[PDB]
Design a protein around this nucleic acid. Structure first.
Lengths: 85, 83, 60, 44, 175
RNA sequence: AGUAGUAACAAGAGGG
RNA sequence: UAUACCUCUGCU
């Protein structure tokens, strides 16, 4: 449901879902199923990639702050959510 | 899989219930995150419980203009179109 | 090639006088409609616009 | 062909170009670029 | 010899000669006949099996695939915004900006037909808001002289006006 | 005056 | 009203 997703998900995922879904012609008011699906699909893409970095030695690590800063690199790149091009 | 065969893309399949299935059951992501995801997806399933075409048409102003344009002995653009 | 040996052939070097002044947008509407006969009505309507806009054209 | 803010398109690439130019190609330059990317993106 | 009628939306003395009386002299005449045209157009269809079919079909794919960009190409167009001729790229950009400043932004999609839709909707909004530019003169001091400078002035046009401006076709002498 | 030819040029606009 | 100057323009 439009209000259910807009209540249970954050502005970034809402805006990203609102973007990515606007391509075929459908919209969250009529086609809620795919809006929520893409929203959740997005949320998982976030949760999967967030907080995960790689060390200079080459080791995999997780952290709280999530601001990279030189000594660490993001382990996963988030392809989904960006523009097709 | 029977669609992504050939290309060696990593497939990870989750579910709202809790079960899980990745490619060859070699889970690259650490356990705490994969658990947290399965928590979020569970909370979503709980919350969810406790909670083509192509068209084009004349608007009035232009429709009247269409009705105006056509030959004499005709009243409507729809009528002339039908004729 | 299509004619017989016992036939005449004349050619006329031709110019139509006042070509544009005597061609009507209403007829263009008739044409565009008849050409599009049997096609989707959104496509039928979309093309029919220009003939109409021309039928109701004003000049500076 | 694209329906998106001209600046967003530039930023999104500005990140990955800056990243992959390091990842598989200095992190202080990378951080400097990402800092700038964010610094701008802050401004409305 | 045609039939005169005043247009509802314009008030223009519109003459209609089609299906009018048949002429009876060799002088130039515009009294064509719809049924006679349709007969020829039909015969043309008859003589070329499925020509109109593929012809339309190609136009369908064209229409569907055509971006708005394609309209920046081509000859100059009369810009109703400025009441002057302008290059297509600008004449379009102006119309889009005005459409945007008013309540029209389907073209934002990025496909010609969506822009093409807006044009038919724009005939509804009776009070169309357009920005004008005019020459004002300021006063400057030197370490005092007049100065020229351009200012902007918002104006709104009536249905009567915008509809006319949209149906307006500019004229020039061919050299 | 002259160019020109179905209407223009023979400077235009500004410091008014 | 006149006379000198000064700036912009040469398909817009």
């Amino acid at each position: 449901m439009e209000n259910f997703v807009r209540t249970n998900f954050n502005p970034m995922i809402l805006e990203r879902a609102e973007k990515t879904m606007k391509e075929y012609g459908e919209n969250p008011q009529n086609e809620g199923n795919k809006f929520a699906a893409i929203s959740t699909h997005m949320e998982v893409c976030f949760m999967y990639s967030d907080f995960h970095f790689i060390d200079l030695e080459g080791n995999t690590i997780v952290k709280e702050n999530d601001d990279d800063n030189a000594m660490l690199k993001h382990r996963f790149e988030i392809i989904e959510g960006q523009e097709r091009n | 899989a029977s669609k992504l065969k050939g290309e060696n893309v990593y497939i990870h399949i989750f579910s709202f219930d809790g079960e899980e299935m990745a490619t060859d059951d070699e889970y690259i992501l650490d356990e705490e995150s994969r658990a947290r995801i399965k928590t979020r997806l569970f909370v979503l399933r709980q919350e969810l419980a406790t909670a083509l075409e192509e068209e084009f048409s004349y608007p009035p102003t232009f429709q009247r203009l269409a009705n105006q344009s056509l030959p004499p002995s005709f009243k409507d653009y729809h009528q002339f179109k039908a004729y | 090639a299509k004619s017989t040996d016992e036939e005449l052939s004349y050619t006329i070097t031709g110019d139509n006088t006042k070509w544009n002044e005597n061609q009507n947008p209403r007829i263009f509407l008739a044409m565009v409609l008849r050409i599009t006969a049997g096609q989707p009505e959104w496509f039928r309507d979309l093309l029919a616009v220009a003939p109409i806009m021309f039928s109701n054209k004003v000049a500076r | 062909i694209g329906m998106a803010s001209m600046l967003d398109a530039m930023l999104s690439r500005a990140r990955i170009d800056a990243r992959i130019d390091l990842e598989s190609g200095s992190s202080q330059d990378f951080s400097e670029i990402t800092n700038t990317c964010k610094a701008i993106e802050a401004l409305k | 010899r045609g039939i005169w009628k005043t247009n509802s939306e314009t008030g223009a003395q519109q003459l209609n000669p089609i299906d009018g009386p048949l002429p009876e002299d060799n002088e130039p005449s515009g009294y064509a006949q719809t049924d006679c045209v349709l007969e020829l157009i039909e015969g043309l269809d008859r003589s070329h099996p499925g020509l109109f079919e593929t012809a339309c079909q190609e136009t369908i794919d064209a229409i569907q695939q055509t971006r708005v960009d394609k309209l920046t190409q081509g000859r100059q167009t009369y810009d109703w915004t400025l009441n002057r001729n302008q290059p297509a790229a600008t004449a379009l950009a102006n119309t889009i900006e005005v459409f945007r400043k008013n309540g029209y932004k389907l073209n934002e999609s990025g496909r010609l037909i969506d822009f093409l839709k807006d044009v038919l909707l724009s005939f509804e909004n009776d009070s169309m808001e357009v920005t004008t530019h005019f020459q004002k003169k300021k006063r400057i001091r030197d370490n005092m002289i007049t100065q020229r400078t351009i200012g902007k002035k918002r104006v709104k046009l009536t249905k009567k006006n915008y509809l006319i401006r949209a149906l307006t076709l500019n004229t020039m002498t061919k050299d």
